[PDB]
């Protein structure tokens, strides 16, 4: 529950937060591993 600042002379709200982690397996298969292989071939 967020209450606003005191007025010398924004409204109060209820905020629901979602901290969410991405699961990167797709990008590990489609981008990272081909890049690693290309880097070995560049070696």
Partner 1 sequence: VTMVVVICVIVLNIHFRTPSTHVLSEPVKKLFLETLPEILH
Ligand X SMILES: CCCCCCCC/C=C\CCCCCCCC(=O)O[C@@H](COC(=O)CCCCCCCCCCCCCCC)COP(=O)([O-])OCC[N+](C)(C)C
β-sheet bridge partners, residue 13: 2
Main-chain dihedrals φ then ψ at residue 13, nearest 5 degrees: -150, 165
- CA distances to 9, 15, 18, 29 from 4, rounded to whole Å, are 14, 13, 22, 47
The only residue of 29, 31, 32, 37 in contact with partner 1, by rule CB under 8 A: 37
The only residue of 30, 33, 34, 38 in contact with ligand X, by rule CB under 6 A: 33
Find the shortest distance in angstroms from Cβ 41 to partner 1. Answer: 6
Residue 32 in contact with partner 1, rule: CB under 8 A: no
The binding site for ligand X (CB under 6 A) comprises 28-29, 32-33
């Amino acid at each position: 529950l967020i209450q606003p600042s005191v007025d010398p002379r924004r409204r109060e709200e209820v905020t629901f937060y979602l901290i969410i982690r991405r699961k990167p397996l797709f990008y590990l298969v489609n981008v990272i591993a081909p890049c690693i292989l290309i880097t070995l071939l560049a070696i």
